[PDB]
Amino acid sequence: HWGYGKHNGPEHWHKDFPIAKGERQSPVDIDTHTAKYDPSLKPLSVSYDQATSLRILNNGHAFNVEFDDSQDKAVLKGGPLDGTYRLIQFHFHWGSLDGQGSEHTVDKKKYAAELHLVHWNTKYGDFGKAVQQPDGLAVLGIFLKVGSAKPGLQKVVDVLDSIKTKGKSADFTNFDPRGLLPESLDYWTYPGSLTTPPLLECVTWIVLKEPISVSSEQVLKFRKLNFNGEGEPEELMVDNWRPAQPLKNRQIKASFK
Numbered sequence: 001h002w003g004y005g006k007h008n009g010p011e012h013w014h015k016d017f018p019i020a021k022g023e024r025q026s027p028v029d030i031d032t033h034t035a036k037y038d039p040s041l042k043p044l045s046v047s048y049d050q051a052t053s054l055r056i057l058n059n060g061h062a063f064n065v066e067f068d069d070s071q072d073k074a075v076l077k078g079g080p081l082d083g084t085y086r087l088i089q090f091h092f093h094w095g096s097l098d099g100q101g102s103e104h105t106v107d108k109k110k111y112a113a114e115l116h117l118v119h120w121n122t123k124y125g126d127f128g129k130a131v132q133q134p135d136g137l138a139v140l141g142i143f144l145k146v147g148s149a150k151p152g153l154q155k156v157v158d159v160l161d162s163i164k165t166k167g168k169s170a171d172f173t174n175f176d177p178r179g180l181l182p183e184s185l186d187y188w189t190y191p192g193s194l195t196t197p198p199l200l201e202c203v204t205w206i207v208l209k210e211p212i213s214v215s216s217e218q219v220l221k222f223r224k225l226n227f228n229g230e231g232e233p234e235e236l237m238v239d240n241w242r243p244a245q246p247l248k249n250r251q252i253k254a255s256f257k
């Protein structure tokens with residue numbers, strides 16, 4: 001099945017998922033000089049005070065922190081979005097080395113990692129119905145650079161031991177996603193897709209300009225995770241990022257002057 005290696009990696013995905021070569025694939029390179037300030041964007045609103053985390057899961061491609069989305073509790077709205085999008089999970093993509101790991105790039109610059117906070121449009125009732133819609137999802141992307149530690153990331157780093165291999169999960173309640181946000185909400189936005197199979201073209205991407213810093217010791221622990229399941233030959237979970245895809249018929253809008 002699909003993965004990030006030579007034989008089942010991004011260059012292979014089109015075979016099972018032909019939309020891989022579609023008209024609004026992600027990630028993309030953000031050319032900061034071609035992105036246009038858009039004065040028609042409303043301010044962005046990230047309301048995570050009632051967020052309720054439940055569980056953390058190694059799914060063999062990354063780890064997901066999953067949230068209880070059965071009620072109106074952690075929402076994204078405003079910016080390019082119409083209506084209300086509810087947080088369902090976050091995950092990261094990262095590299096084998098600090099020079100690579102983000103999926104989006106900014107003037108061809110690769111960050112050490114990228115955080116994806118995934119939300120579904122509440123007019124569609126649930127996540128499964130939302131991913132059949134062109135405006136079903138909104139993903140808030142945040143770059144990570146290696147420098148100072150992020151304190152609000154450490155509870156996630158400390159639980160990674162317990163989810164080393166594919167299919168392991170642990171209880172992960174009362175995690176506050178606010179502690180993963182940079183100061184500025186300046187962002188670029190464009191229409192795109194999931195960056196993993198099934199690569200559905202259902203996503204409004206909101207990529208923040210300001211990266212958060214995490215420590216080398218924090219990102220080192222992400223790299224100790226495994227793609228394989230327990231008792232299998234060890235393949236470190238590293239380089240689980242898809243490269244930049246053709247922009248095609250799309251414009252990237254900036255929220256800031």
Ligand SMILES: Cc1occc(=S)c1O
Pocket residue numbers: 116118139194195196
């Ligand atoms: C599984 C999944 O869902 C939403 C967004 C992304 S990038 C992803 O991998």
Ligand SMILES: [Zn+2]
Pocket residue numbers: 091092093116195
């Ligand atoms: Zn992702």
